[PDB]
Structure 1
């Protein structure tokens, strides 16, 4: 029995809210004490570009941005039964990274 922390990072929330809810009820069905999904503040990345290949124009900038959503789940589980909980929902936009308990 450990105190492990799974971290879930994604770029779209509707593809992450399905994966993060899969890990909660996936461990409520397997009767673990699960601290709920804790939602970190998002990370918007805001490259702004001149939009013109030359320098001629009316100076119209070009605001690109990319939000990064990060949610983390803390468990109360041993090292074995979490592996079939981890390896059942990839959903390629989500990067599930499981940390270690002791640290």
Structure 2
């Protein structure tokens, strides 16, 4: 066996993150696993403002760099054993995946 596994995904583009969300939960839907919905964590916007010129002469123009981090949480909590059934990862570049038991 009895296990509960929390899976969290984090990437930079929402399209491939929604795709890696979709195909993983879809396979569990065929494999009769009770899947909690994708928990959309608030997006972490990494903003850095940097002076454009390298020398410090001009009309004092800056540059605002945004970097979007999107995290989604998927819960694979079926009453039976889960670890052996799900062995593949089928992951794509740009995403970081994680496996953690619900104990910690």
TM-score (norm 2): 0.88
Could you list the runs of 4 or more consecutive aligned residues of structure 1 that deviate by over 4 angstroms after TM superposition? 77-84
Tell me: CA distance 1:28–1:59, structure 2 relative to 1, closer, same or farther (3 Å). Answer: same
Name the CA shift for 1:75/1:40 in 2 (closer, same or farther; >3 Å): same
Greater fraction strand: 2
Question: Tell me, what secondary structure is at the counterpart of 2:24?
Answer: helix
Contact 1:50 1:60 in 2 (8 A): yes
Residue 35 of structure 2: aligned partner: 34
In the alignment, structure 2 segments of 5+ residues that lack a partner are none
| Contact 2:3/2:82 (<8 A) preserved | no
1: distance between equivalents of 2:61 and 2:84? 51
How far residue 92 of structure 1 moved from its aligned partner, in angstroms, is 1.1
Question: Could you tell me the TM-score, scaled by structure 1's length?
Answer: 0.89
Shift, 1:85, TM fit? 3.8
Q: Deviations over 1:33-92 (max 9, x none)?
A: 111111000000001001001010100110111010000101124897546646342101
- In 1, the alpha carbon distance for the partners of 2:54 and 2:10 equals 34
Alpha-carbon spacing, 1:28–1:93, altered in 2? closer, same or farther (3 Å): same
- Whole-Å Cα distance in 2 between the matches of residues 79 and 58 of structure 1? 65
Contact kept in structure 2, 1:46 and 1:66, CA below 8 Å? yes
CA gap of 1:83–1:53, structure 2 versus 1, over 3 A, is farther
